[PDB]
């Protein structure tokens with residue numbers, strides 16, 4: 309169960325994760341189906357079914373999304389990425405901060 | 420302007436140091452949490468994240484991952500670099516703390532959520 | 541898309557939502573299919589309200605008062621209709637664990653989703 | 660010893676009043692939000708929740724829904740009643756704000772999250 313490869317989630321978004329170095333660091337591109345491509349950066353815990361997390365630095369909005377989850381192996385043997393994300397929006401005054409963070413899930417399978 | 424480069428501390432007492440943010444918003448840093456839950460020892464862990472460059476906002480959004488060096492878990496933060504009314508820089512963040520579970524059926528319980536406020540140290 | 545009825549979620553949990561009165565208030569029971577405690581699962585009550593402002597697909601929220609654990613879970617979502625006319629309860633929940641000292645609060649809340657269909 | 664009955668105020672400046680908590684831990688009350696993002700005039704809204712009764716812990720957990728009367732949204736709070744070193748009662752809570760979207764395809768963006776700290780008013 310390694311994050312490298314092409315992934316697709318329930319919303320139809322695509323994700324491509326490059327190589328994961330010894331420290332667990334990886335890069336990739338994120339193709340969002342709902343709102344376009346944007347780079348992503350994250351690391352995977354090193355110490356089989358590891359936990360991971362990455363940031364998606366969007367290039368068509370001021371927002372930032374972070375994903376985190378675990379690489380599982382289904383009963384049938386397929387790799388499944390079960391993750392949750394926080395989508396931070398850009399507010400002007402810090403008084404509007406209470407409404408800036410959304411939350412949700414995404415399930416990825418090998419594209 | 421509010422830049423993440425610097426040394427920060429949050430309401431739990433954890434300390435965070437963020438290096439330089441390059442022309443694309445990518446940065447790296449270390450995280451020294453004040454709290455834990457594992458049987459192992461607390462250790463300065465690396466963090467990798469990015470800062471939004473769209474419009475070069477003076478209060479941009481950001482998000483980074485903390486790859487813990489003593490726990491099997493992973494934590495992701497995201498928030499906004501804010502400038503107070505007095506003029507002090509403050510980070511308003513929310514984090515997800517993914518736990519490691521061997522059963523994919525145990526996945527429903529492997530994600531904690533919380534907040535964190537950061538100021539310069 | 542009324543909440544009244546019996547529902548089942550992706551985790552295999554069942555919940556029966558009684559009648560929703562004029563103000564949107566409703567009561568019911570929740571039979572969770574999963575737990576990590578050592579205690580035996582036990583049907584627990586739920587109390588929640590439904591938004592009446594204006595709808596075909598209203599937003600709602602309800603608390604589950606667990607009777608076998610010291611914790612508390614709250615759900616909130618929207619009643620949707622599919623392309624095949626099927627009712628779906630898309631929800632997210634916050635699971636509050638009981639901690640000893642307020643200092644241990646940071647690690648007390650879990651988060652997740654649950655999709656419901658009529659049983 | 661830490662009961663939710665009484666009038667509370669949060670870090671945002673909002674106020675709520677929690678009536679009586681019965682044997683089963685059920686309770687109702689009122690919530691007057693201090694902030695909002697709709698131009699509709701903020702209108703006092705009812706709330707329904709329940710307190711955990713297992714073991715009658717001095718610091719129980721709780722949750723309640725707030726049925727907004729001036730918006731199509733719903734917010735759920737869950738937390739714990741604490742007694743700090745000083746002796747004051749505090750409510751540590753996290754909330755989900757479910758927005759009303761038209762189609763089920765917009766559902767992914769209909770739930771916000773945050774915290775609130777309440778102290779007796």
Ligand SMILES: *[C@@H]1O[C@H](CO)[C@@H](O[C@@H]2O[C@H](CO)[C@@H](O)[C@H](O)[C@H]2NC(C)=O)[C@H](O)[C@H]1NC(C)=O
Nearest residue numbers: 547548551552553554555571572573574581659
């Ligand atoms: C939710 O309800 C369904 C149906 O009412 C339950 O399904 C039954 O589960 C038992 C347990 O193994 C089986 O022996 C029955 O054959 C099932 N019946 C049907 C019609 O499927 C289900 O167990 C309930 N879930 C929980 C957690 O109680």
Ligand SMILES: CC1(C)CC(NC(=O)CCCCC[C@@H]2SC[C@@H]3NC(=O)N[C@@H]32)CC(C)(C)N1O
Nearest residue numbers: 319321340342343366369371373393397414768
């Ligand atoms: C709510 C919304 C639309 C959020 C902001 N969206 C964007 O900027 C588009 C880029 C992010 C969308 C991808 C998310 S990310 C998690 C989820 N998982 C997945 O695969 N796609 C989705 C824009 C503003 C703030 C204006 N509004 O508010």
Ligand SMILES: CC1(C)CC(NC(=O)CCCCC[C@@H]2SC[C@@H]3NC(=O)N[C@@H]32)CC(C)(C)N1O
Nearest residue numbers: 431433452454455456457490492494514518647
């Ligand atoms: C044991 C297990 C599964 C793992 C725990 N991981 C740790 O102990 C590593 C220490 C770093 C975490 C610090 C968090 S990170 C966000 C917040 N902000 C801050 O500064 N500290 C806290 C976690 C849990 C409780 C899930 N359990 O217990």
Ligand SMILES: CC1(C)CC(NC(=O)CCCCC[C@@H]2SC[C@@H]3NC(=O)N[C@@H]32)CC(C)(C)N1O
Nearest residue numbers: 551553572573574575576577609611613633637
């Ligand atoms: C830490 C842990 C394992 C988690 C919590 N476990 C419980 O609360 C007991 C089981 C009842 C909760 C059912 C949830 S609710 C959302 C999800 N959706 C669904 O259908 N079931 C699940 C708290 C404590 C600390 C007791 N334990 O220990």
Ligand SMILES: CC1(C)CC(NC(=O)CCCCC[C@@H]2SC[C@@H]3NC(=O)N[C@@H]32)CC(C)(C)N1O
Nearest residue numbers: 407671673692695696697727730732734754775
């Ligand atoms: C504008 C719209 C569609 C509706 C908004 N609904 C409202 O205006 C109704 C009242 C808001 C409740 C106040 C929250 S509740 C948790 C927190 N604790 C507290 O005391 N206040 C805040 C919501 C948003 C802006 C998301 N969307 O966009």
Ligand SMILES: *[C@@H]1O[C@H](CO)[C@@H](O)[C@H](O)[C@H]1NC(C)=O
Nearest residue numbers: 316320321322339340341419
């Ligand atoms: C994802 O990849 C598949 C296969 O290449 C393609 O059919 C689909 O259109 C892609 N979706 C997006 C949003 O790029």
Ligand SMILES: *[C@@H]1O[C@H](CO)[C@@H](O)[C@H](O)[C@H]1NC(C)=O
Nearest residue numbers: 428432433434451452453540
């Ligand atoms: C953070 O730094 C300050 C000053 O350098 C120090 O007093 C404090 O103990 C540090 N906290 C942690 C958790 O390392």
Ligand SMILES: *[C@@H]1O[C@H](CO)[C@@H](O)[C@H](O)[C@H]1NC(C)=O
Nearest residue numbers: 668672673674691692693780
């Ligand atoms: C909450 O109560 C205080 C106490 O007087 C009051 O000043 C404040 O206006 C109240 N909040 C709102 C939103 O009315």
Ligand code: NA
Nearest residue numbers: 400401403404
């Ligand atoms: Na504003």
Ligand code: NA
Nearest residue numbers: 521522524525
């Ligand atoms: Na298990």
Ligand code: NA
Nearest residue numbers: 640641643644
């Ligand atoms: Na403690």
Ligand code: NA
Nearest residue numbers: 761762764765
């Ligand atoms: Na739409």
Ligand SMILES: [Zn+2]
Nearest residue numbers: 347348443445
């Ligand atoms: Zn990059």
Ligand SMILES: [Zn+2]
Nearest residue numbers: 331333465467
């Ligand atoms: Zn690294």
Ligand SMILES: [Zn+2]
Nearest residue numbers: 585587683685
């Ligand atoms: Zn009850």
Ligand SMILES: [Zn+2]
Nearest residue numbers: 563565705706
């Ligand atoms: Zn009511």
